């Protein structure tokens, strides 16, 4: 060989390896992180991302009166003046009135432990289970997986059960319990960085995904107020708004208002999510975090730091200022904070972009108030759902843009009314900001999920399960309502999702029917619990070995196995194998007898019924084995013993066929 | 200048760039971290 081609092949190997290494650098520095699941519980009756979308799209204000079931002396802790200990001038704020509600029995927690358990831990457990279920992952099957749990939380002072009271109130447990109840093995870290806590955690989660330390991660936050201390003490300096509405970027901005909530995201690398065939909702492209540093007091924002973190997040995402279509601004509603944030957004985003595509600025806090540590992650959920619906929801309580900042540039505009999101020439992109009181800023950039058959199996079983019969009925009713608002979904896809992507619990039920006219009524009958023809119900046994019974004479009828010969290929193959093994000492073909073709002997003759029954029974047993039901034993009955022997491995197919055929002939 | 020696320069550039990229990967994943400063206050009169 000439030296030219000899060195050319080496050059080809070298440049291919160089391309591989460069791609590895690209995916190790900044890989896109897929948000494969989300869950949230927010004020205003929100308990899912769809609920949050319904709230924001309708422009509903979730601010409401204080809770009365928490032992608060709500009548005796309101006075108008802004300077008094133990008193506040705020009437209303966001709340989770079902914060104490918790399904203790589901997670194996006794009632006494649950009473001495922080509400944050309970809410985080429920939200994490919901997020895993919404991601297409069975939460039970995640046991032993290298899944991280990064959670933003704070010590809110919630306080035979002496042991439970210790681990039931430590903030470090707030993430750890999630990885203990579910059995996860990735790192569990509880972040605490004030309002930036959750979003910061998400950034850390992305790093944990990029280094390979995790295959999946939970990034989220939780905020609960067991006591009104956040309202009485913080109101001394007129920090809260009088009416309790977080007027974001409005001239009437005269303070903020607190709110409870919880929001988690099950996040995985985009390549890994694509490999496993997971549904990608959005894609965190890049993130950045820094600190205000030197500023006019510890609790005061700095526009330069916000510009820096926005630019750093854009650079990490590899996206321009003009590439982002909208931003979920922090928007605390404070008089001093809002102009600073507006100036930062104008300097960073609205500097070089077309005049006809201004940056749309919104704020979830206008709807639900300042959700606290859980705010930032909750923000992206909004910016995910809008990104799914292509509609930017309006920000409430904006009589006009605030005059402190100058909107003369026109590059940044508030979402006074809903604006349709264009879906042309590029993926939809957005940003979320979670600027914190302690000074730690955080900015996240989201991008629209990238754009991504088999024949329908007949009579696909629809499986349902639950811990208790009431939970099973609730599951059936919820599935019926969900399917009602759906334009003719594929039944096989629903069957696969129910069978694979859901945990099998104790109390089980099934719906098997070949037509899509009885499934709805059957689901209803299960919901109210009345019986139905195609409905099956039962209680699974935790332990027990399986047995295959092989009865002898009696179980014969004309045309048996005729339909399986056409529909089922495995049954046809097994019948063909039995036919080949049986042809030696038999003067007819089994397939003709089963199909009932002309001239074949009927089942009245003794010498043919036992071979046919043996072959059908063996084929059915092997079909059961093909579906994963491997017997732990076998039992026969007269001639069926022969068939049982063939399944026991005692006799080969040829030997069993010989025995049954010659014994029947004798 | 013939191709047999012309391609050698490209191969040398390619392998140098490959070594640089591999060094970048190793630095990005497992670079050691130097402890340049230390401080502690612990029981028993410890202050350094």
């Amino acid at each position: 060989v000439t030296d030219s081609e000899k060195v050319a092949e080496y050059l080809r190997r070298a440049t291919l390896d160089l391309r591989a290494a460069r791609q590895r650098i690209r995916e190790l520095e900044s890989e896109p992180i897929a948000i494969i699941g989300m869950a949230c519980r927010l004020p205003g009756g929100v308990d899912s991302p769809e609920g949050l979308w319904e709230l924001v799209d309708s422009g509903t204000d979730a601010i409401a009166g204080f809770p009365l079931d928490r032992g608060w002396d709500v009548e005796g802790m309101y006075d108008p003046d802004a300077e008094a200990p133990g008193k506040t001038y705020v009437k209303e704020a966001g709340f989770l009135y079902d914060a104490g509600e918790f399904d203790a029995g589901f997670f194996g927690i006794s009632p006494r432990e649950a009473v001495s358990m922080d509400p944050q831990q309970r809410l985080m457990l429920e939200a994490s289970w919901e997020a895993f279920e919404r991601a297409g992952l069975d939460p039970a099957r995640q046991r032993g997986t290298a899944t991280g749990v990064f959670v933003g939380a704070t010590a809110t002072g919630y306080v035979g059960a002496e042991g439970f009271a210790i681990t039931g109130n430590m903030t470090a447990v707030t993430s750890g319990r999630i990885s203990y109840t579910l059995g996860l093995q990735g790192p569990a870290v509880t972040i605490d960085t004030a309002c930036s806590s959750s979003l910061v955690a998400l950034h850390l989660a992305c790093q944990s995904l990029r280094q390979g330390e995790c295959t999946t991660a939970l990034a989220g936050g939780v905020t609960v107020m067991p006591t009104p201390t956040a309202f009485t003490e913080f109101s001394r300096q007129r920090g809260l708004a009088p009416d309790g509405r977080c007027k974001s970027f409005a001239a009437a901005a005269d303070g903020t208002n607190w709110a409870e909530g919880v929001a988690v995201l099950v996040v995985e690398r985009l390549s890994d999510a694509r490999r496993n065939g997971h549904r990608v909702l959005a894609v965190v492209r890049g993130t950045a975090i820094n600190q205000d540093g030197a500023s006019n007091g510890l609790s005061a924002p700095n526009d330069l730091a916000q510009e820096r973190v926005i630019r750093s997040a854009l650079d990490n995402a590899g996206l321009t200022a003009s590439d982002v279509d909208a931003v979920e601004a922090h928007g605390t509603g404070t008089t001093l904070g809002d102009p600073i944030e507006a100036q930062a957004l104008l300097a960073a985003y609205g500097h070089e972009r077309p005049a006809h595509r201004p940056l749309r600025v919104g704020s979830l806090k206008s709807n639900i108030g300042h959700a606290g540590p859980a705010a930032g992650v909750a923000g992206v959920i909004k910016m995910v759902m809008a990104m799914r619906h292509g509609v930017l929801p309006r920000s409430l309580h904006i009589d006009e843009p605030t005059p402190q900042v100058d909107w003369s540039s026109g590059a940044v505009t508030l979402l006074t009314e809903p604006v349709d999101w264009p879906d042309s020439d590029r993926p939809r992109r957005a940003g979320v900001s979670a600027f914190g009181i302690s000074g730690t800023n955080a900015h996240v950039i989201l991008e629209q999920a990238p754009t991504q058959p088999a024949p329908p199996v007949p009579a696909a079983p629809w499986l349902l399960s639950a811990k208790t019969p009431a939970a099973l009925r609730a599951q059936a009713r919820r599935l019926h309502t969900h399917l009602a608002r759906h334009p003719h979904p594929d039944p096989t896809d629903i069957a696969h999702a129910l069978a694979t992507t859901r945990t099998p619990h104790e109390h089980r039920a099934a719906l098997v029917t070949d037509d899509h006219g009885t499934r709805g009524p059957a689901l209803a009958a299960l919901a109210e619990g009345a019986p139905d023809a195609c409905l099956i119900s039962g209680t699974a046994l935790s332990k027990g070995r399986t047995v295959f019974v092989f009865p002898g004479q009696g179980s014969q009828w004309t045309g048996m196995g005729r339909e399986l010969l056409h529909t089922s290929p495995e049954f046809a193959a097994y019948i063909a194998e039995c036919e080949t093994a049986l042809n030696d000492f038999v003067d007819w073909s089994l397939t003709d007898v089963l199909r009932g073709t002309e001239g074949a002997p009927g089942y009245d003759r003794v010498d043919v019924v036992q071979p046919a029954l043996f072959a059908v029974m063996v084929s059915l047993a092997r079909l059961w084995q093909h579906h994963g039901i491997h017997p732990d034993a076998v039992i026969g009955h007269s001639q069926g013993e022969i068939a049982a022997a063939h399944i026991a491995g005692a006799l080969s197919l040829q030997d069993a066929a010989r025995i049954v055929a010659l014994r029947s002939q004798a | 200048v013939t191709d047999s020696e012309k391609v050698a320069e490209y191969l040398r550039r390619a392998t140098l760039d490959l070594r640089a990229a591999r060094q970048r990967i190793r630095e990005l994943e497992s670079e050691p971290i130097a402890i340049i400063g230390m401080a502690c206050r612990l029981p028993g009169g410890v202050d350094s």
Partner: antibody, heavy 118, light 114 residues
């Protein structure tokens, strides 16, 4: 770190001779073939010449406009390259760059200015 | 039968928009090796030239990730994602199929757009 530093530029009268030196550091100087490329003040880059490595015999090659007048040499003991220009003309005034590689100029020196005028 | 290359003589840019310089050769530069014997160099104002792209697509180490070469046969293109103030200069695309190369060509001036 790869470094190529040039020296020996400056003014010269027409018809005289000059010796532009190019010192290399941070890599095996023997392997690479060294090239000289000149830029007139206003025009595009012009390739002057180059010299192969010792393993290839150290044969040199020169542009048409500088054949005979110019001579490229090297020494691997000190790891230096030399461009000996003889009987310089007025149009030879230019910034001369020393580079490693006979066909791929992957690294360039800072460049040295040479002026020819009486 | 010497090979010559033609490119746009000038190309205004903006600080942030994409940019794309093009080159066309009168002969197919695809060697029998399956490589495009083309190289892109950049000369910044008052600085020595540096190598941006070699063999059409491969990016030299130390160059920013913004630059990317593409094309094959006769048509080639250097694409810049983010144009910055320091990216202004002269971009020379020059072949290596037929050596020696007498000149680098007129180049392609790049300057800010207004």
């Amino acid at each position: 770190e790869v470094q190529l530093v040039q020296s020996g530029g400056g003014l010269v009268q027409p018809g005289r001779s000059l010796r532009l030196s190019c010192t290399a550091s941070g890599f095996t100087f023997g392997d690479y073939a060294m090239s000289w490329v000149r830029q007139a003040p206003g025009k595009g880059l012009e390739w002057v010449g180059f010299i192969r490595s010792k393993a290839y015999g150290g044969t040199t090659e020169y542009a048409a406009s500088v054949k005979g007048r110019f001579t490229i040499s090297r020494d691997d003991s000190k790891s230096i390259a030399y461009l000996q220009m003889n009987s310089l003309k007025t149009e030879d005034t230019a910034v001369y760059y020393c580079t490693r590689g006979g066909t791929l100029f992957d690294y360039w020196g800072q460049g040295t200015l040479v002026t020819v005028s009486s | 039968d010497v090979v010559m290359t033609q490119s746009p003589l000038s190309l205004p840019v903006t600080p942030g928009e994409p940019a794309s310089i093009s080159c066309r050769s009168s002969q197919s530069l695809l060697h029998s090796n399956g490589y495009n014997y083309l190289d892109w160099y950049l000369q910044k104002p008052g600085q020595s030239p540096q190598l941006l792209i070699y063999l059409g697509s491969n990016r030299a180490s130390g160059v920013p990730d913004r630059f990317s070469g593409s094309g094959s046969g006769t048509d080639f293109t250097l694409k810049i994602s983010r144009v910055e103030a320091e990216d202004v200069g002269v971009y020379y695309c020059m072949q290596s199929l037929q050596t020696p190369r007498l000149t680098f060509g007129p180049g392609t001036k790049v300057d800010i757009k207004r």
